């Protein structure tokens, strides 16, 4: 009965920019702004604008516009951050600049004697250690840079077995606070990827169970 037990860590980076809004949600936001300006109350800006217009009207028979002009000028002068970088999406797939709107996860180049597989990192467990121990051990073995994945739960996230003799990997999940891409020249091609592109990448059906497990969102 030759058995083997492995622990693995699945870090999920949350996106830093909001989702691109659906047109439905866009026109409803416009409508909500409309209803809000309709049922809103007066402000100091409206007070000063209206009463200064009234003062000017009176003085004709006897500012807010400049401020908003200056503010619009400052806005036009200012430069905003870039959302999408198609160049990085093409030639810099192992980076963050390509996608900031959706969550990300990595994939490592793994090789086995029985079958070469493009799968998620894992490591071998030994008795005097916890599964989370093996998880952060894999993390420290693969990272080789200034990044830590903050854990969120001790419970198991995936169970996946395969025979040749028998191997059983248990997946935990974790959160990524920081992350870089130093030591760019690596044997294991670590690449942050989304769920659909991960599905395009890797075949297996234990991995398909991982697909149905992981949240799309």
């Amino acid at each position: 009965s030759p058995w083997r037990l492995l622990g693995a860590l699945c870090l999920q980076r949350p996106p830093v920019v909001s989702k691109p809004l659906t047109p439905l949600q866009e026109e409803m936001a416009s409508l909500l702004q409309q209803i809000e300006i309709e049922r809103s109350l007066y402000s100091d800006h409206e007070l000063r604008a209206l009463d200064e217009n009234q003062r000017l009207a009176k003085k004709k028979a006897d500012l807010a516009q400049d401020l908003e002009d200056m503010w619009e000028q400052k806005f036009l002068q200012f430069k905003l951050g870039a959302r999408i970088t198609e160049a990085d999406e093409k030639n810099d797939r192992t980076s963050l600049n390509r996608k900031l709107d959706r969550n990300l996860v990595l994939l490592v180049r793994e090789k086995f004697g029985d079958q070469d597989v493009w799968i998620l990192p894992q490591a071998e467990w030994q008795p005097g250690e916890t599964l989370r121990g093996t998880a952060e051990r894999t993390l420290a073995t693969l990272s080789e840079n200034n990044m830590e994945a903050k854990f969120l739960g001790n419970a198991p996230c995936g169970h996946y077995t395969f025979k040749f003799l028998g191997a059983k990997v248990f997946f935990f999940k974790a959160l990524l606070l920081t992350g870089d891409f130093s030591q760019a020249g690596n044997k294991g091609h670590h690449v942050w990827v989304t769920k659909d592109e991960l599905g395009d990448y890797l075949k297996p059906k234990y991995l398909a169970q991982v697909r149905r497990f992981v949240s799309d969102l």
Partner: protein, 143 residues
């Protein structure tokens, strides 16, 4: 009547309330944001999904807001902003369930928010009442 089998048919007080691991004390959730409406809406979403999950919720309340003035001294310019803080108290969340709970919260988290999750402490509970100075003066006099 007592002797008869119908005794105890009406009693209800035992139905109504009378007045280690996998057992999590009352936890508090702070939500700080510049937009009172965003904070309130997010807290309402959290409360509704908690009620749907049948997870217990003690109470939800607002901490004292605070306004901060920021001034740029290249020449003197001024501006002001506000910060609102909501708080929720929960209990009884299972160990493994808390994982997906917090994960879904993080995922549905909208921009312009800062959320903390901690154990409820008397410090938090006493940071709501007015900082009465009288007790401090009497304590100093005692010292």
């Amino acid at each position: 009547y007592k002797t008869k089998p119908t005794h105890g048919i009406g009693k209800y007080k035992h139905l109504i309330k009378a007045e280690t691991d996998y057992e999590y004390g009352v936890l508090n959730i702070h939500l700080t944001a510049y937009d009172m409406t965003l904070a309130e809406s997010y807290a309402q979403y959290v409360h509704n999904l908690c009620n749907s999950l049948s997870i217990k919720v003690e109470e939800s309340y607002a901490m004292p807001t605070k306004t901060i003035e920021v001034l740029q001294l290249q020449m003197l310019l001024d501006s002001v902003l506000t910060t609102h803080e909501r708080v929720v108290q929960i209990s009884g969340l299972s160990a493994t369930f808390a994982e997906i709970f917090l994960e879904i919260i993080q995922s549905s988290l909208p921009e312009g928010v800062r959320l903390s999750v901690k154990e409820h402490t008397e410090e938090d509970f006493k940071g709501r009442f007015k900082a009465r100075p009288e007790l401090e003066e009497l304590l100093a006099k005692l010292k």
